[PDB]
Write a protein that binds this ligand. Structure first.
Ligand SMILES: [Br-]
Length: 210
């Protein structure tokens, strides 16, 4: 087979099944570029800081998870075509990504009005004028209470993407860098039924309402 990094990038693009296991220790690393090790795992790849166990070094873009908080990947971090991006597992969490803008990983219990308030101090958000459009990818868990994710007061456009059902399930989000400050996003979900194949996570047109 190819390098584990290439295997992931091909699984994403081809819409194949290839799971990702993350070491929790990665959440102690700040957002931005990160040197990790990739290893074979049952049905997929493990990403950690273990230099042994047939580990293959890779430089990725990384976005940690933090309890009760948002974490942000700034687009200034993004350059190298075909570099992979990952965030930690979504456990009821939300991911909001602006095309050419930041990516936010928001923990499950943070209310939508609160996380939008926090997001909106970012320079990319301040530059997004009411009545104008951006391309935004937004992913939440299906069946979660609407107060934890509904941004309809703020954005008009396509509905969010969802993962899971009945407020159960997890997701993995990653990406492939396509250029300066540019990435294409991919996702899969894990439920009682098993893990889905990768598919695109689509940026949709959104107009800012207020
Ligand atoms: Br929840």
């Amino acid at each position: 087979p190819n390098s584990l990094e290439a295997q992931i990038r091909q699984a994403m693009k081809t819409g194949s099944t290839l799971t990702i296991e993350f070491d929790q220790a990665l959440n102690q690393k700040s957002p931005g570029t990160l040197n990790v090790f990739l290893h074979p795992a049952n049905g997929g790849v493990r990403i950690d800081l273990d230099s042994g166990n047939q580990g293959e070094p890779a430089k990725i873009l990384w976005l940690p998870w933090k309890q009760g908080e948002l974490q942000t990947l700034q687009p200034g971090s993004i350059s190298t075509v075909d570099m992979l991006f990952f965030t930690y597992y979504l456990s009821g969490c939300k991911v909001f990504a602006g095309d050419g803008g930041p990516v936010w990983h928001i923990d499950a219990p943070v209310e939508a009005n609160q996380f939008w308030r926090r997001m909106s101090s970012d320079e990319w958000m301040e530059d997004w004028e009411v009545g104008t459009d951006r391309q935004v990818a937004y992913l939440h868990r299906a069946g979660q209470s609407d107060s934890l994710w509904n941004l309809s007061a703020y954005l008009e456009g396509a509905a969010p993407s969802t993962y899971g059902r009945d407020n159960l399930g997890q997701a993995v989000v990653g990406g492939i860098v396509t250029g300066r400050q540019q990435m294409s996003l991919y996702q899969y979900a894990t439920t009682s039924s098993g893990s889905s194949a990768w598919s695109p996570l689509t940026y949709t047109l959104q107009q800012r309402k207020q």
